[PDB]
Structure formats: structure tokens, C-alpha cells
Design an enzyme around this catalytic site. Structure first.
Site, PDB file in Angstrom:
ATOM      1  N   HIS A 241      35.240  33.556  45.399  1.00 41.80           N
ATOM      2  CA  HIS A 241      35.470  34.820  46.105  1.00 41.80           C
ATOM      3  C   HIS A 241      34.236  35.647  46.283  1.00 41.80           C
ATOM      4  O   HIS A 241      34.208  36.449  47.177  1.00 41.80           O
ATOM      5  CB  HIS A 241      36.447  35.683  45.356  1.00 41.80           C
TER       6      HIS A 241
ATOM      7  N   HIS B  28      36.889  28.979  40.959  1.00 42.69           N
ATOM      8  CA  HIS B  28      37.760  29.539  41.916  1.00 42.69           C
ATOM      9  C   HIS B  28      37.458  31.037  42.111  1.00 42.69           C
ATOM     10  O   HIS B  28      37.373  31.508  43.220  1.00 42.69           O
ATOM     11  CB  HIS B  28      39.230  29.304  41.467  1.00 42.69           C
ATOM     12  N   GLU B  29      37.320  31.767  41.039  1.00 49.01           N
ATOM     13  CA  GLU B  29      37.048  33.212  41.161  1.00 49.01           C
ATOM     14  C   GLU B  29      35.595  33.510  41.672  1.00 49.01           C
ATOM     15  O   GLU B  29      35.385  34.425  42.478  1.00 49.01           O
ATOM     16  CB  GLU B  29      37.258  33.923  39.817  1.00 49.01           C
TER      17      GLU B  29
ATOM     18  N   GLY C  82      43.788  35.167  37.762  1.00 50.23           N
ATOM     19  CA  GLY C  82      42.452  35.694  37.952  1.00 50.23           C
ATOM     20  C   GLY C  82      42.415  36.664  39.135  1.00 50.23           C
ATOM     21  O   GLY C  82      43.326  36.677  39.953  1.00 50.23           O
TER      22      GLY C  82
ATOM     23  N   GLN D 185      38.843  40.830  46.514  1.00 45.57           N
ATOM     24  CA  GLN D 185      40.242  40.721  46.911  1.00 45.57           C
ATOM     25  C   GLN D 185      40.958  42.088  46.915  1.00 45.57           C
ATOM     26  O   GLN D 185      42.057  42.210  47.454  1.00 45.57           O
ATOM     27  CB  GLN D 185      40.961  39.727  45.995  1.00 45.57           C
TER      28      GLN D 185
ATOM     29  N   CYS E  47      46.512  31.408  44.877  1.00 47.41           N
ATOM     30  CA  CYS E  47      45.658  32.575  44.972  1.00 47.41           C
ATOM     31  C   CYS E  47      46.524  33.712  45.578  1.00 47.41           C
ATOM     32  O   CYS E  47      47.254  33.518  46.566  1.00 47.41           O
ATOM     33  CB  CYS E  47      44.518  32.206  45.913  1.00 47.41           C
ATOM     34  N   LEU E  48      46.388  34.905  45.045  1.00 48.09           N
ATOM     35  CA  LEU E  48      47.161  36.072  45.530  1.00 48.09           C
ATOM     36  C   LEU E  48      46.801  36.468  47.001  1.00 48.09           C
ATOM     37  O   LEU E  48      47.625  36.990  47.728  1.00 48.09           O
ATOM     38  CB  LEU E  48      46.948  37.230  44.549  1.00 48.09           C
TER      39      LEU E  48
END
Ligand code: NI
Ligand code: NI
Ligand code: NI
Length: 160
Positions: free
Chosen positions: A138, A134-135, A47, A52, A92-93
Site C-alpha cells: 500500500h 501486503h501492507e 492490517g 487506505q 483487503c478492506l
């Protein structure tokens, strides 16, 4: 291919702005979406949220071919369907090298707009539900370390 911001960067702490309805269906929104796909996909993530990559918009993408349909979600709204929570491993990236176990709602309803302004309204459970929570975190300036309640399950990926 866009630079993924890393935890510590103050931009990840913002409450993202809604996508304006003027931009729904535009080439610019398209380009952003394509960049996000290219970016997510190059680093191998499930995702990515627009913040981000430094873009202050309520836009996320996610997909996993427990498969999860490729989805582009704008201006989302999440509604937990019950009180049942479930722990799962997350990464997570923007937090490279780490994994942590996080408790999320097992089942949610999510709503929002697709990139053309068509309404999305899904009820989902398990992993799909986790990815969406989770997304959308952000978009309210939250990374998963801020959601961990058991620190014994937070560590470097290769160590865990
Ligand atoms: Ni407007
Ligand atoms: Ni590829
Ligand atoms: Ni993330």
C-alpha cells in the site's frame, strides 16, 4: 472510525511520504494510530496502511491474535531473505467482497521505526511475512490484484 478508501480511488496509487522524525512520539501520530486501530478493528481486518484512510504516510498496522504480533511500523524497508515464494489467499478492506491468491516471499527481514522512533528489525516467515509484504505494498500504491499471477484464483469471497 475512518472511511476506508476503495480500489479505484487515485489516492491508493500514491507512493506514501515517510513519517517525519518531528512527528515521532507526538500526540498527533498517536491519534492517527488509534484511529487506524479503531478502524481496522471495527471492520475486522488483519492490517491497515495509512493511505487506505487517505493519509499520505509510510505507516502501517497489523496484528492477528497463525498469530501475528500487533505491530506499528513506520518507514519500512523489506529485504527478501531468499528466493522462495509461496502462494496464499489474500483479501483487503479496500477491495471488499473479493479474495485472490498471491505469490509472496516466504521469508523476509523487515525494518522501520516504531511510533517513538525506536528501530524495528525482524526476520519472519509464512503469514507474518505475507501480511508485512501486503501492507507495505500500500505504501508504493499497489493493491493485491496487481500482484496476482494466476487469475483463476481471483473471485468473489462467497463464490470462492
Ligand atoms: Ni525533518
Ligand atoms: Ni471489538
Ligand atoms: Ni490491503
Amino acid at each position: 472510525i475512518r472511511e476506508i478508501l476503495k480500489m479505484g480511488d487515485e489516492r491508493l496509487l500514491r507512493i506514501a511520504q515517510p513519517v517525519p522524525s518531528e512527528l515521532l512520539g507526538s500526540e498527533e501520530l498517536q491519534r492517527l494510530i488509534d484511529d487506524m486501530f479503531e478502524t481496522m478493528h471495527h471492520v475486522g481486518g488483519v492490517g491497515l496502511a495509512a493511505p487506505q484512510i487517505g493519509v499520505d504516510l509510510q505507516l502501517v498496522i497489523f496484528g492477528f491474535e497463525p498469530a501475528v504480533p500487533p505491530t506499528i511500523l513506520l518507514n519500512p524497508r523489506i529485504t527478501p531473505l531468499d528466493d522462495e515464494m509461496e502462494e496464499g489467499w489474500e483479501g483487503c478492506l479496500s477491495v471488499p467482497g473479493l479474495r485472490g491468491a498471491v505469490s509472496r516471499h516466504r521469508r523476509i527481514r523487515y525494518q522501520g521505526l516504531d511510533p517513538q522512533g525506536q528501530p524495528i528489525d525482524r526476520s519472519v516467515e509464512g503469514f507474518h511475512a505475507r501480511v508485512v509484504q501486503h501492507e507495505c505494498d500500500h505504501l508504493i500504491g499497489r493493491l493485491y490484484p496487481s500482484r496476482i499471477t494466476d487469475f483463476s484464483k481471483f473471485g468473489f469471497t462467497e463464490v470462492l
